[PDB]
Amino acid sequence: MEKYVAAMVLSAAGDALGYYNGKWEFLQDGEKIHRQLAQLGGLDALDVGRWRVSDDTVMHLATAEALVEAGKAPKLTQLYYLLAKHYQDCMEDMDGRAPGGASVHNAMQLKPGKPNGWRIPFNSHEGGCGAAMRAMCIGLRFPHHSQLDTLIQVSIESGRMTHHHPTGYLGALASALFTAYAVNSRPPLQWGKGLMELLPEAKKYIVQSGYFVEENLQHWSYFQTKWENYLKLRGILDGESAPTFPESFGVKERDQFYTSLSYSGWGGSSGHDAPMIAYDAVLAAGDSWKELAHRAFFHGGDSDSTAAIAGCWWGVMYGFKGVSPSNYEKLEYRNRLEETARALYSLGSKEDTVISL
Numbered sequence: 001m002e003k004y005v006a007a008m009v010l011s012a013a014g015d016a017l018g019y020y021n022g023k024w025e026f027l028q029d030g031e032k033i034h035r036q037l038a039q040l041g042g043l044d045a046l047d048v049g050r051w052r053v054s055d056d057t058v059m060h061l062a063t064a065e066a067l068v069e070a071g072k073a074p075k076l077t078q079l080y081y082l083l084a085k086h087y088q089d090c091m092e093d094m095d096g097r098a099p100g101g102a103s104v105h106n107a108m109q110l111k112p113g114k115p116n117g118w119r120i121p122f123n124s125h126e127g128g129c130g131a132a133m134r135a136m137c138i139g140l141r142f143p144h145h146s147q148l149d150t151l152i153q154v155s156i157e158s159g160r161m162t163h164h165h166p167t168g169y170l171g172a173l174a175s176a177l178f179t180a181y182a183v184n185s186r187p188p189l190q191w192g193k194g195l196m197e198l199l200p201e202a203k204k205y206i207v208q209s210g211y212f213v214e215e216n217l218q219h220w221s222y223f224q225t226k227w228e229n230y231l232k233l234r235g236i237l238d239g240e241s242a243p244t245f246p247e248s249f250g251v252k253e254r255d256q257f258y259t260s261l262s263y264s265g266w267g268g269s270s271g272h273d274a275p276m277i278a279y280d281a282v283l284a285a286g287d288s289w290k291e292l293a294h295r296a297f298f299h300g301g302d303s304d305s306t307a308a309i310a311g312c313w314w315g316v317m318y319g320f321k322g323v324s325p326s327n328y329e330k331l332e333y334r335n336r337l338e339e340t341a342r343a344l345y346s347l348g349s350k351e352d353t354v355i356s357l
């Protein structure tokens with residue numbers, strides 16, 4: 001129970017903490033964020049009562065609520081109607097939340113109701129993190145090994161309702177997949193290898209689905225190459241070694257590393273690097289919420305987004321252990337988050353099968 005509740009609540013807490021009503025998301029100097037954090041009394045002193053969640057939580061809740069509404073043994077046509085509907089409707093709750101461009105534009109284009117009304121054309125600039133930031137609960141719903149093909153399909157299609165570009169929707173796959181791994185207590189050092197092994201199954205799905213096959217295949221290597229290079233850097237390509245971090249890896253060094261991971265200069269703003277930064281933070285932090293926050297919530301990149309992902313994976317594994325109550329007790333939508341988590345638990349914690357397209 002607690003771990004699903006923590007998954008949803010701490011994902012949202014991370015989003016709020018990284019965001020700081022826009023002040024910290026858009027600060028590009030991680031050292032300055034850390035100084036302002038110290039002046040506020042440090043992470044344990046932060047009270048989120050007045051720290052709004054951003055687009056990341058509003059969309060993650062929208063994915064979660066659609067999964068709960070679709071119920072047991074759902075038809076994927078029904079689940080995709082609900083997802084499209086929630087994604088479109090939730091754009092009405094983005095005031096002061098700094099929504100991402102593909103997210104807001106394409107959610108408002110959707111036509112749920114029409115057969116395939118949730119599909120959009122391939123686009124060269126739909127590689128943002130907006131698909132990845134809202135996908136983690138898919139793993140909460142479909143954690144069992146038997147459901148892997150379902151997790152792959154739903155993460156991908158949920159993503160390309162707004163991000164029809166492998167760098168975008170493969171980020172959704174990573175977010176959902178690593179959540180499932182966390183639910184099953186798979187050691188985090190194994191997770192990157194799991195993703196690499198499953199990319200060919202994601203391709204099989206994209207190919208057979210039959211939409212913009214050539215464009216998808218032509219853009220496929222970016223995601224896979226960036227992840228391979230990252231896993232090799234950490235010494236974890238094959239999932240059979242503890243990670244190795246650089247000697248000098250303080251706040252400034254991490255800002256620089258995150259920028260190096262990035263597509264166009266804003267670290268964690270894409271489908272490849274949002275989950276990658278969250279993962280790097282989980283790997284280093286272990287059971288330390290504070291270390292997780294310092295690495296995934298407070299940096300010069302797209303920090304609420306890396307936070308939303310990291311906080312979900314971490315809460316799944318550790319619950320609320322060692323988290324200051326002020327970091328979540330008065331969090332926006334706390335009640336909706338807890339209620340959806342419990343309903344996802346009831347669905348997720350007993351293995352069922354979907355009716356495919």
Ligand SMILES: Nc1ncnc2c1ncn2[C@@H]1O[C@H](COP(=O)(O)OP(=O)(O)O)[C@@H](O)[C@H]1O
Binds near residue numbers: 102266
């Ligand atoms: N082909 C692409 N590959 C990787 N990242 C991309 C691509 N196209 C755009 N981006 C990234 O998406 C980010 C902006 O995404 P955004 O406006 O926030 O859309 P969304 O936020 O809904 O994902 C930019 O920082 C840019 O780096």
Ligand SMILES: [Cl-]
Binds near residue numbers: 044
């Ligand atoms: Cl601190």
Ligand SMILES: [K+]
Binds near residue numbers: 026029299300
């Ligand atoms: K930032």
Ligand SMILES: [Mg+2]
Binds near residue numbers: 056097305
């Ligand atoms: Mg955000």
